[PDB]
Design an enzyme around this catalytic site. Sequence first.
Site, mmCIF file in Angstrom:
data_model
loop_
_atom_site.group_PDB
_atom_site.id
_atom_site.type_symbol
_atom_site.label_atom_id
_atom_site.label_comp_id
_atom_site.label_asym_id
_atom_site.label_seq_id
_atom_site.Cartn_x
_atom_site.Cartn_y
_atom_site.Cartn_z
ATOM 1 N N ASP A 120 0.850 -1.201 0.000
ATOM 2 C CA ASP A 120 0.000 0.000 0.000
ATOM 3 C C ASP A 120 0.879 1.242 0.000
ATOM 4 O O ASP A 120 1.960 1.204 -0.631
ATOM 5 C CB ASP A 120 -0.987 -0.091 1.167
ATOM 6 C CG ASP A 120 -2.254 0.703 0.928
ATOM 7 O OD1 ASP A 120 -3.312 0.148 1.157
ATOM 8 O OD2 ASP A 120 -2.162 1.890 0.583
ATOM 9 N N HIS A 160 -3.644 5.925 3.602
ATOM 10 C CA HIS A 160 -4.373 4.748 3.078
ATOM 11 C C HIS A 160 -3.781 3.459 3.647
ATOM 12 O O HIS A 160 -4.530 2.656 4.196
ATOM 13 C CB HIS A 160 -4.351 4.723 1.555
ATOM 14 C CG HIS A 160 -5.263 3.721 0.966
ATOM 15 N ND1 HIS A 160 -4.838 2.500 0.481
ATOM 16 C CD2 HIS A 160 -6.594 3.785 0.748
ATOM 17 C CE1 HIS A 160 -5.891 1.854 0.013
ATOM 18 N NE2 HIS A 160 -6.964 2.623 0.144
ATOM 19 N N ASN A 170 -13.565 -0.129 -6.597
ATOM 20 C CA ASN A 170 -14.600 0.848 -6.190
ATOM 21 C C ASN A 170 -15.339 1.380 -7.403
ATOM 22 O O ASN A 170 -15.720 2.553 -7.400
ATOM 23 C CB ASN A 170 -13.969 1.966 -5.352
ATOM 24 C CG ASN A 170 -13.227 1.431 -4.148
ATOM 25 O OD1 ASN A 170 -13.625 0.458 -3.521
ATOM 26 N ND2 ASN A 170 -12.087 2.032 -3.854
ATOM 27 N N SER A 193 -10.978 -1.192 -0.504
ATOM 28 C CA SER A 193 -9.684 -1.093 0.208
ATOM 29 C C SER A 193 -9.879 -1.309 1.722
ATOM 30 O O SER A 193 -8.904 -1.673 2.414
ATOM 31 C CB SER A 193 -8.993 0.242 -0.047
ATOM 32 O OG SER A 193 -8.258 0.202 -1.256
#
Length: 279
Positions: A39, A69, A161, A224
């Site tokens: 990430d 994130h 998404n 996520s």
Amino acid sequence: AAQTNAPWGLARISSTSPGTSTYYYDESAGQGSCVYVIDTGIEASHPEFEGRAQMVKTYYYSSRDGNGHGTHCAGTVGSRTYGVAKKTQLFGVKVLDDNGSGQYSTIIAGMDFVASDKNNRNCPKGVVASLSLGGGYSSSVNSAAARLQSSGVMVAVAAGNNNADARNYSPASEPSVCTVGASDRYDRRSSFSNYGSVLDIFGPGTDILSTWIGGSTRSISGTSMATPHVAGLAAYLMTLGKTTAASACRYIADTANKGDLSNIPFGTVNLLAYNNYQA
Ligand SMILES: [Ca+2]
Ligand SMILES: [Ca+2]
């Protein structure tokens, strides 16, 4: 163990029903498992990680999570307050820049890195990789996720998404890994969640409270956010010896809450990650 007033997602994965507030989990809590969070990095200093997180690789100038994130995802995997597997060892692999973007080549390199790096770590209960990232279909990105899975790492990847079929997104479209869709606290498919036949499992993805950079916390939404629930649940279940990296995705789907979700299109699994914990 019972965490009262837990984040709804932790409560959801330890309940057959939505709307509960306690996260019930075996006290082992993923102890002895490792989870690679591939990430933006992990603010390992965050008190919520209790010194259980460390950066092991960056593909940018710093290992520092300048985005948040990765820290959020890592928090959902194994932070004390916001994590599924509260005693797992977290390893940060920073493949995404501080804007949260990453070249496919870099993301592939990070997956190849984990496949090798796990051989250097003490993870007696097994290894998980959480890939809360994705873009367009890429045979090379899917092949990278398949390699990481084949090496003996439980790979959980975000479905994406796009509110579209995950078949057009990578590594979501890689069949061999655990493709994770997002649900909301009302057991609806998250409005943004990808779907399709390649989805293995849903996890809590909407309004997920977790760690953030600067020692802070925040609530954000995404596949996520669902991915680290499943990654954390895999680490948790492997520590309990209930499953292995090769079979964790199948085990989680077999032991899931079946048919609890709404807005599940025809041909998409109606399976919500569930730890089946009985005190
Ligand atoms: Ca139910
Ligand atoms: Ca799969």
